[PDB]
Design a binder for this molecule. Structure first.
Ligand SMILES: CC(C)(COP(=O)(O)OP(=O)(O)OC[C@H]1O[C@@H](n2cnc3c(N)ncnc32)[C@H](O)[C@@H]1OP(=O)(O)O)[C@@H](O)C(=O)NCCC(=O)NCCS
Ligand SMILES: O=C([O-])CC(=O)C(=O)O
Ligand SMILES: O=C([O-])CC(=O)C(=O)O
Lengths: 449, 448
């Protein structure tokens, strides 16, 4: 398989580069660590490595250096489905791992690997899923199915057998192919059992990864196939620091296999502060429609935007801290909506927000970012095509994010990064030692080296 | 319950006291964050808060300021079981939570709480356990059983209904009581199904928590009850930065409940670099035994030590990623072994390792810590009383670690710490800017 032959060349090299960097640049200072970091969820602390993707304040997220437009439309457009426009997540995955753009042949090889392996979900995984009460939250069901599949781990087996650290990345790759193939099967099972009368649809062997998930969920429509292709591409990866990504690396760093690390990641994504943003934006859009008996006027949205901001509150999916432009994941969803569902009423509200909400934020003068993120746009696309089960939105997110989490876990075992073991501190020590400590970026701080 | 009354007063205080520290002292610097930290698993980086315990390199772990000798033997001895010496983990949990030594009454109230709620493991949790193939790794089964019981989460439910941030710690304690009560039941089920012909033994309502685990595994001797008590006491907690404690805090920080954060932690504990040490040591000790036709001499082991080191191998059970002298968890086990099984052959090798192996590892000079950790001692004890199922040792570890993980997660939801979200950096950036960056502790850093 092309991907694997290539990685067999790239990874020894990267491994050697990282060993040198660590040796020659390890004592290089990047920032001050503070009391506020320790009590403040490490916000801003550069404590982690991720090479798959990278957020730039002025451009948004990039995937191995390429922008979304380059891959979606521009001169480096990733392969599509036949007749398709949207990039195949399969191709992105080739990109995230190798840093090179795939050939049509490269994508086809990965599609075949995915389709084949999708037929190989153990029967016992379904037994595990049916044993859970049907009212269990779907993200609990999703994490449990994944974890039960740990029995098939090639990594865990070869580790018990004795393998060289140099083989880690290969076992991780095999496990990743298996797991990613399985994910839309496990997710669809959950969807069907919970929401569609416990009728089960087999994988179509002539559909790509993304399309098989819509199909098995019971949505056979070309637009849906495209939406899901775009969705999975967009939400694939967003650095290493978000809870789900970090959970994955953290558990990976102890040599736990991908079924253990990613299911752990999903218990993190299941958290209300991490995995619910899409849903809240959608519920808000729906609350605007019902409030104004329809799409509001330009004037009503401004007034309801001013009331909300002036009353201490925020507008969901707008004005996150980091970026200084519109999230390029937002832009690609807008372009999908305009093309495919422009007259949908909830879309019209989101559209109206893109005009109105940035103007009111600039005039309100607090947020250096007046622009939306990805979660502003995703919920209405799902609801339009009939995916209306809020709780399940996080599962779709989860299936996407596996692309990035698997890429990253393959890479860092290729690099042989060590176990994550930070130092914790006590409130006692802080209180004993606080006064004694220099303020950061201060003359005293400069004094103490 | 005394515990909860006590927390109902202490938590609003600590919460106010933490908010004060973040405001007043947040911008105080502790250390240089370096490129090394990012590529080196954050080793040394002060990125986390934990008040349950603290590892002092030249003293070892302390539990709310109290040493292991203080709590087990010396001037602050925690409640034991009727007729017992070894401290009950129920009382240590009280300590961890409140910062205060419990009475007999305090401890008894918690035992009773564990014992009652131990009857309340849902039938569907056993359905899930039985749907996994019996050859599944025990730590996968454990994590999965815990995770299935997320459906009974009080915290997740109260969060959906709308609850005040102040109510969080209450819903976390409730969930923790339920989950701690269930773990011995889930673990014993795994044990009996995997290794003991799938015959199952019910909780005994008149035993304490640790002893019930032993009972439900099929071990009823008093000395085993005592071992489990000690074992659970020693493995309870070890700061906030080990992979299992950290995974628990991380997942907890996004408001995921203790069934989610602790099952995530167990997946981390399942990792060879975190949860496997006890077994490696036992195998190694048994390998010496077989090799020397019994207990070696000082000379034989001294030689063997050197030949292992100079062949680029690890001496398992010695050295740590933070500890710097003898692990006081090791000394507690040695005491137990001298007291209860001084003539066990494998123990005698462990003992002999204690004399010889430190001095050897000093001279070799690669190990930063030349002394033994806790995993040097735990295996021979388990093996001696007939717990011989290597892979299951990590589950025992996990049951015990739940004590600290639940304590930490209750407290932090009391303090209202926010989501954990560090920044990742790229190799590309590092290659772009590294030369231009100041060396940590330089004149250039002092100017910048
Ligand atoms: C716990 C442990 C993993 C910590 O590793 P660490 O933080 O990298 O350790 P150090 O800072 O002491 O490493 C410095 C050197 O000492 C070596 N070292 C430490 N203890 C050693 C031992 N018992 N035998 C051989 N070499 C040892 C390391 O391999 C390293 O050499 P390297 O640069 O060639 O890799 C390590 O002590 C170990 O492997 N112990 C044996 C297994 C064990 O008992 N684990 C239980 C841990 S709870
Ligand atoms: O929090 C982050 O860094 C990124 C993220 O989760 C998201 O895109 O939803
Ligand atoms: O703290 C560590 O790094 C490992 C350990 O001993 C423990 O978790 O008990």
């Amino acid at each position: 398989m092309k991907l694997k032959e290539r990685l067999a060349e790239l990874i020894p090299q990267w491994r050697a580069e990282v060993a040198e960097i660590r040796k020659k640049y390890g004592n290089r200072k990047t920032m001050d660590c503070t009391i506020g970091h320790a009590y403040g969820g490490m916000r801003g602390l550069k404590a982690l490595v991720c090479d798959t993707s990278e957020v730039f304040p002025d451009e948004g997220v990039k995937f191995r250096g390429y922008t979304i437009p380059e891959l979606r439309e521009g001169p480096h457009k990733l392969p599509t489905a036949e007749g398709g426009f949207e990039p195949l997540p399969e191709g992105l995955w080739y990109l995230l791992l190798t840093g090179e753009l795939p050939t049509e042949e490269d994508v086809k090889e990965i599609s075949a690997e995915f389709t084949k392996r999708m037929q190989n979900v153990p029967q016992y995984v379904f037994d595990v899923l049916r044993a859970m009460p049907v009212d269990t939250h779907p993200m609990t069901m999703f994490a449990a199915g994944i974890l039960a599949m740990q029995r098939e781990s090639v990594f865990a087996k070869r580790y018990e057998e004795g393998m060289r650290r140099e083989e880690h990345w290969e076992a991780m790759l095999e496990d990743s192919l298996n797991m990613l193939a399985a994910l839309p099967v496990i997710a669809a099972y959950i969807y069907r059992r919970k929401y569609k009368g416990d009728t089960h649809i087999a994988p179509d062997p002539n559909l790509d990864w993304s399309a098989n998930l819509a199909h098995m969920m019971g949505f056979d429509d070309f637009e849906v196939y495209e939406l899901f292709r775009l969705y999975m591409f967009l939400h694939s990866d967003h650095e290493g620091g978000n809870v789900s990504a970090h959970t994955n690396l953290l558990v990976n760093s102890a040599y736990s296999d991908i079924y253990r690390s990613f299911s752990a990641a999903m218990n993190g994504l299941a958290g209300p502060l991490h995995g619910l943003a899409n849903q809240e934006v959608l519920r808000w859009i729906q609350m605007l429609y019902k409030k104004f008996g329809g799409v509001p006027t330009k004037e009503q949205l401004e007034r309801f935007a001013w009331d909300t901001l002036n009353s201490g509150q925020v507008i969901p999916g707008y004005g996150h801290a980091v970026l200084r432009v519109t999230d390029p994941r937002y832009v690609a969803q807008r372009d999908f909506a305009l093309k495919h569902l422009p007259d949908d009423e909830l879309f019209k509200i989101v559209s109206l927000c893109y005009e109105v909400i940035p103007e009111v934020l600039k005039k309100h003068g607090k947020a250096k970012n007046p622009w939306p993120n990805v979660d502003a746009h995703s919920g209405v696309l799902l609801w339009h095509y009939g995916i209306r089960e809020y709780d399940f939105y996080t599962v779709l997110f989860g299936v996407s994010r596996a692309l990035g989490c698997t890429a990253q876990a393959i890479l860092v075992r290729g690099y042989m990064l060590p176990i994550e073991r930070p130092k914790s501190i006590t409130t006692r020590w802080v209180k004993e030692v606080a006064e004694s400590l220099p303020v950061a970026g201060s003359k005293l701080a400069a004094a103490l080296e």
